[PDB]
Each structure stands twice: as C-alpha cells, then as structure tokens.
Symmetry: D2
C-alpha cells in the first residue's frame, strides 16, 4: 500500500510506464506521469484521475537536468512530496542488426536508458537522503532470456544501467533510500514488480535486479 | 606472428594501449597508434619505427565518427590494410559519491566508452566483413561496485553481442578485463590466429 | 499473510531456518519444523506454539527420501495440507582452505545443499502440481559478495542448487507452482525474503534468486 | 610444445577426452588416458603410442579417491611426473521432467562431476604445489535451463574458486565450456605455457 506517497513515473504515457502508473495509483500513491509527450502524459493522468486517483501529467526529457528537476519540484510542490522514482526504459524500438543502428538511435538509447538514471540520481536522491526514506526503481529495456542478435546496443547500455543502479544502491545503503531494478525479459508482472519494490514490504531489498516476464 | 597484419590501437600513446602497441609491433605487425594526444601518438609511432617496426601516429577522439574513420582509412591507405582493432578507451577515476559526479565526468565514462565501441563497429567491422577476416579486441580499462563500474559490464556485454552478430563471419570479437604485460599478452593472443576458436570471450587478467 | 497455509521449513532448529520458521508462523502459517536434531526441531515448535502459533517438530535427514516423504505426509495429515517448502542450507561450518576440506564435509555439503533439493522436488512438487498451487524457496549457503578463498566447495554446490532451482521453475512455470531461491550474502532480511517469496504477493516471481544481506 | 610434460586426461577413451588426449600427445606430451572403460583407455593409449607418442591407459572412476590417486601415482612413476590434469567427466542427458529423474541419474550428474573435481584437487594439486607448477583444466561436458544445467555452473564456479585458492602458486586452474577440435584446441592452449597469464578463466567454445 502506497497511501500518502508520491511517485514519479517516467515513460508514463505508454508501455510499461503506463501500466506501472496505473498500478501505483491503484495502490494509493499520487503519481506524476512524466513523458516526452505532454499530451500522452496528460491522458494517462486523466485516466488515473477518472479511476479515483490523484495524478498530474508533465512533459519531460529525462536526458535534460532542467526537465528532470522541474518534475521533482512539481511533485514536491503540488502533490506534497516525493518518495518513489520509477525510470522507464523505452520500447527498444525495432530489432535490427548492430550495424544498421544509426547514430541517432544509438544516441537516443544512451539518453533515455542511461543519462536519465544519472539525472534521476542527481535530482531525486538528495531529497530522499534528506527525508531519510525513498525508493528508485529502474526498469530496463526488454531483452530476451539468453538474447540473440538485434538488441546489441540496447543490451550494452542495459548492462551499464543495472550496474549503476547496484552501485548507487551501495552508496545509499544506510540512508533508508533503496535503489533497485527490473529486467523485463521476453506488463502486469513488470508493474507488479515495480509496485512491490516501491512498497515498504520491499524495504529489505536494495541493489537488486528482478528478472520478470515481460 | 602478426607479420602481414595491420592493427589499430586506440588509447595507444600510454598505459595499456602503449604496451599493446609495442607487443603487436614486436609480433611483426604494422600499427596505427591512435590517441587523443597527437604528440604522444607520434612519439610511440617513432619509437616503434625506431625498433624496426612499421607505425603511423594519428590524433583520434574515439567518440567521433570522422576521427575513427580517419584512423581506419589511413591504416588501409598508408599501412596497407587492417585486420585488427584494439579498443582501449577507459581512464582512472577517483571514487567519489555519485552526487559529486558532474555530467561531463559521467559522459566521459559511459558516453565515450560505449560510443567508441559503436564507431569501432560502424567504421572497422565492414572492412573485416568484406575481406572475411578480422579481430576486434575491447580492453575494459575504465577504472567493489562503483558509479563507473557499468562501463566494464557494457564493454563485455557489447563484445559478446557483437560477436554473436558476426558468428561464422571469420570476424572474431573478444575482450580483455584488466583487474600491463599480462594485458598485452592477452591482446596479442586474442588478435592472433592462435585464438581463432575464440569469439565473444572476455579474458580476465591481472593488470 | 499465510493464514490457513502449511509450510515445511528444513534446517528449522537454528540459524536461518529458525528465523524463517518464526517469521512464517508470525504471518499465520502452520509450520512443520524439520531438522536433523529432533529435540532442536521440537524446541523451535514449542517456542512458535507458545507465541500463538500452530507448529510441529520432526526429525528429518533431507538427504533421505523416506525422511523427506514422511515430513511431507506428516504436514498433510496432521496440519491439513502443504503449500510452502523452505529448504535451509547449513551454517557453511568453518572457512578453511580447499584442500583442508575432508571427504565427510564435502559429502555433507552435497547431501544438505543439493541432494535435499532433489528430494524436496520429488516429495513436495507432485502435491503442489496436483493442487495447482505451491511455493518452494531454497535458501543457499551464505557466501560473501565477490567471495574469496575458504568456501570453494560451498560456492560450487551453491551455484549448482541455484541453477537447479531456476531449472525446476521453468518446468513448473505454468502449474501455479513457484520455485525461487535466496542467496544470503555477508537473519531478519533472510526471513523477510523467504516470507515475501512464500506469499501470494510474490506470485509473479519464479526462478529468481534474491540476494539479501545475511 | 607440451614436450617434457605429463598430462592426465579423464574420460579419455572417447568424446572430448579422446580428442584432448590426441592433441596433447601430438604436442609431444606423455598422456595417462583415464576412463571408466579400461579397454577403451588401453585402445586410445595404444593408438597414441602407435602414432609415436607416450601413453598408459588405466581404468578410473573419478568419483573414487583410490582410482584418481592411482592415475596420479602411475603418471609420476611410469610416465615420469605430472604437470597437467584435464577433467572431462560430463555425459549426454535426455531432457526429461525432473520428477522422472531417478536419484542415480541425479548423482551421476551432480555427485560425480563435483566429486571428480574434488578428488582432482586433493590428489593432483599437492604435486603441482610441491613443484611450483601445474595446470588443471576442467571441461564442462555435462549435457535452456535444465535439471542438469547446474553441473556446468558448479564446474565453472569450482574452477574460479580453486584458481583463487592457488593465486601466485605457479598453479593455474581453468575451464572449457563446450556449447571437438575447438575444445581440444582450447585445452591445449590452456595447458601450455602460452596461457600462463590465465587462471580462473572459462573459455566458451563451439562443441
């Protein structure tokens, strides 16, 4: 149960982010839905609101400090605090050979799947440390069990993000702040995993990556 | 015997990359010494030529396409081909709390190391695939879990992914994980025909 | 909450097994405490009973099919069913160099940390499959993070047990039966991990090994 | 060049172990062919001696101390020493539901493979430690997650643990993971001085 708790969910307009926002709001948390797409973010918030929830939509490029700080400040100021930060990876776009991935796609993966976690760390972790509680859950991009070709550059930055998440966790391990990760492997099970990890029943877990059925 | 083979060594002017440049030259291989410091690259090249080897030094920001393509085009045009690419792109890093890490400090570890493997793949592996043979060796020099420990995991992961994407192509892609002689030995082994049964493998060795 | 649920906990008289038995009984489960030591098993059951619980002690060599079948039958007949099976690894005994480990210690590790999981599979899994629900949690022996010398033969059979647990899980994955594992790495966090994995809130997890602070 | 070196190859009468026995003999190394079938071991030994090599065949249940100690004592007494031990002890296994696996079927995978590495360590590594040099190579032949997939993980894990427990001893402990030429090549490499910078390493190669 996450009553009186505030969550930011990035990637919130679609995919795993929308399912995660739905689940956390169903558990009683106030949700700031953050997404590149302001309209998609607002639609998800309207849906959560129509269903009994308290939610707000906000546009945000998780690669930009200012966008990520503004979403943290918006959650604190207008929803009244921040206790949970869920960073959603993208939809992995299409599967194609390593040498067909253009620079723009490579760059986007870096921005959305690694740089976002760095800014999340810089923008949300001090608040958590200050209040002596908080949870960050990083949802990796979806890679197959024993993955084959087609996701080489995704699997690369994914391995980096999971290790950064475990590294951040060791630093914050005696702060009350828990930093954990979800590895969707080919939406209910992804959302259930995030909702459990955000709950106080997961208080004994940090620096963990939970493999779940994508 | 890397005689009759051309090798590009990134980060070649010092550290693991200098030691690799020397071992590979000593094995009889032409070597394009690539590094961020043109002066140091030229220095290593002159030493190698002075030791009886063949070598050209070029300034190269591995995070930039033009720089990597230059190093590749030069090796094919001036050194006479390309059969080996060694990617050394890590640096030392004082472990400080992650909230003291500036964006640049972060990009230098995650953005440079990853994109260097990216440009290495876009720029050099088509030449390997065209001739049906070639070896990429990615030394994870980035320097227990720290904020920067993810570069090494990605380098290893990318090595294994690229290797699968080049299965049965005659193109082998391998890694070295230094935890410098033993590093240069593992590179020279992996770059040699004696390692033709090995692709997608990471060799942990004492640094 | 594990009300109206029956758990077998092996290794139950001491160590992580006792902490796990305490936690599961505190959550409402009936506990058959199984242990090599009949008296230690009975003492733990008496403690759980004095605290509000329903518990029974029973001697059992988890390396022997007959001992393991008798504990399953005892739980079904006298506590009224079986839904949870926790296999506790040993205390890792002492840390000593690989070549100082005698054959008797090597043999004991195999029996307690691997053969037990095979019999648990043969003796408890058909019952779970029959009823279409059930959870098995295998608690590995405690190994350090990035472990050094001293636990070579433990770390060997531990790696085997965790892979067997993931293998068993894939087989039973569409049966309602969840097979999961806990890796104590140097007792509350071990017991919390087992209690969560045994609950219906972990229903979306199978074939997972949870690293936790030992 | 394994000339001037003695090697014990377990499971030597067929499969990966025969191919290893031949490659190592061809490298100039005396070879004690150890296997569960004495006749087949003697056959391989005769073939190797007939090819100009030196070899003795012995029946050996690797799960038993006396059998492994015999193979070790014989190699030191009849073949003139011991510098290499290759552990092949896996077998093929039809994947069936785990509830159809009999206790014996389970012991044959988990008990034999693990205890074989145990006796290999108790029986052979003291000789290596005494002379300050030696190489143990553990080929994980036990044959995606299955009930028997844990043998391979243990073999790799034990290899890395033993290697750490023998750091700086001149005694190297390595593994090969066949997913037979490429297996025998990786064994012969790992057993040779060319691999002296490698301990605690598992080489994945196509089987």
């Amino acid at each position: 149960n996450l009553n009186k708790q505030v969550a930011i969910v990035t990637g919130g307009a679609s995919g795993f982010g929308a399912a995660i926002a739905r689940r956390l709001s169903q558990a009683g948390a106030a949700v700031l839905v953050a997404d590149l797409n302001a309209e998609g973010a607002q639609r998800m918030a309207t849906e959560l609101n129509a269903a009994g929830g308290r939610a707000l939509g906000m546009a945000c490029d998780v690669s930009k400090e200012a966008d990520y700080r503004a979403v943290v400040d918006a959650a604190i100021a207008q929803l009244g605090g921040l206790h949970i930060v869920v960073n959603n990876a993208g939809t992995t776009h299409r599967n194609k050979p390593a040498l067909a991935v253009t620079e723009d796609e490579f760059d986007r993966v870096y921005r959305v799947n690694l740089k976002s976690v760095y800014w999340s760390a810089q923008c949300a972790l001090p608040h958590f440390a200050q209040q002596g509680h908080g949870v960050m859950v990083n949802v990796a991009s979806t890679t197959g069990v024993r993955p084959g070709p087609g996701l080489t550059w995704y699997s690369g930055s994914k391995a980096a993000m999971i290790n950064l998440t475990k590294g951040l966790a060791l630093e914050f391990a005696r702060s009350g702040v828990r930093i954990n990760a979800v590895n969707p492997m080919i939406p209910d099970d992804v959302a259930s995993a995030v909702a459990f990890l955000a709950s106080d029943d997961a208080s004994f877990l940090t620096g963990v990556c939970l493999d779940v059925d994508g």
